[PDB]
Design a protein around this ligand. Structure first.
Ligand SMILES: O=C(O)/C=C\C=C/C(=O)O
Ligand SMILES: O=C(O)/C=C\C=C/C(=O)O
Lengths: 215, 212
């Protein structure tokens, strides 16, 4: 009997992660499981300290003690209210240099590096300096607020299915406009539950026909 | 004016944002701040003037606070799509029949909260659940359900929270509803109160009627 403790960023609950856990549970019934919400940075510390054994996240934080496997690179979308003047680019899509002056929401509020600093790093890379930014606690608030008419917000593709009403998700046409889904584990951790969970990720992935091999 | 509004996270998946968006269009001169805040914590925030309106799912009585029930919303049992209760997707189930199901409550917050509300529904019917687990908040509860860790009673609007591979079984008991109430300072007669209720109506009536 092993209690495997898994860290996750919230937006992954709307993708394939729950299936992967479900699959893992059915295949490994003796291994009990706990899920904890925490940012990618906090997972490094959680992992290092042994608070969690696996970390599913959105950022590659390089570190001696941490082995980091990129699972899938997911396109980014700009979330808007359905009446916002960027409607017209629903089909074609937008470059980030076209919305530098738009009131924008970043998320989450957390110890850096965040998904917030990930986006700001994308702006820097693309020579862009956003004039109107606001930080919001977590993703569902951000989207709620976009629906409430408080600006636009860059999110990953799988945020589309979240359930907040009256939104549109404009494609982002930039080359670097992708958010990597990754699994962080302890470099020294040689437990069998690591390759097992990786087997599940691949099994689910293959069923959904998104199957380049990981690693 | 700077109007400050308290809300619970699940409401963001329903009509509330439309209500805010509408109010914001009709009253452009009024600035708005939205703050996450449990229904219990709303009582104290109102008293302090920390917030002006509270949007919650419980009717916590208090001399200082007026509860305006906006909508009584049906509760549903969230289950994994292969869970043995999927037989009852059409017919629905009773709370007396799920007392022994591994159950997830939420959130983890100062009580009374939605967790104590759900617990009181069983207590009210003389039922005592054999396996309960408190979970931080709704998204995780449903994620866990899809992960195969149990069942979770949730309001109807939770159906649209797009956690994959779930079914939402009707709950047949008469008491099995969650009231969505507006909490305000008792004697507060600001004109944003009637205005916000007007916006609630307009959004409600648009959806009670439309779309085709
Ligand atoms: O995906 C989300 O919903 C939130 C945060 C993601 C990464 C981070 O904070 O490092
Ligand atoms: O609605 C939710 O998502 C959670 C809690 C609601 C009310 C409360 O805790 O008082």
């Amino acid at each position: 009997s092993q209690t495997l403790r898994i860290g996750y960023v919230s937006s992954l609950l709307y993708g394939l992660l729950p299936e992967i856990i479900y699959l893992f549970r059915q295949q490994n019934p003796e291994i009990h499981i706990e899920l904890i919400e925490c940012g990618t940075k906090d997972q490094i510390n959680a992992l290092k300290q042994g608070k969690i054994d696996l970390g599913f996240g959105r950022l590659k934080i390089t570190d001696p003690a941490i082995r980091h496997i990129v699972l899938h690179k997911e396109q980014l979308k700009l979330a808007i209210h359905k009446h916002h003047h960027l409607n017209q680019f629903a089909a074609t899509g937008v470059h980030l240099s076209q919305i530098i002056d738009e009131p924008m929401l970043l998320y989450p509020v957390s110890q850096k590096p965040n998904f917030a600093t990930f986006i700001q790093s994308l702006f820097t890379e693309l020579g862009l300096v956003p004039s109107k930014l606001t930080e919001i606690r977590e993703i569902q608030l951000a989207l709620g607020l976009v629906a409430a008419g408080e600006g636009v917000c860059i999110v990953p593709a799988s945020a589309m299915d979240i359930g907040v009403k009256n939104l549109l998700y404009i494609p982002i046409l930039d080359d670097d406009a992708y958010s990597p889904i990754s699994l962080a584990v302890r470099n020294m951790d040689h437990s069998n539950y690591i390759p097992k969970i990786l087997a599940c990720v691949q099994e689910v992935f293959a069923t959904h026909h998104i199957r380049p091999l990981i690693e």
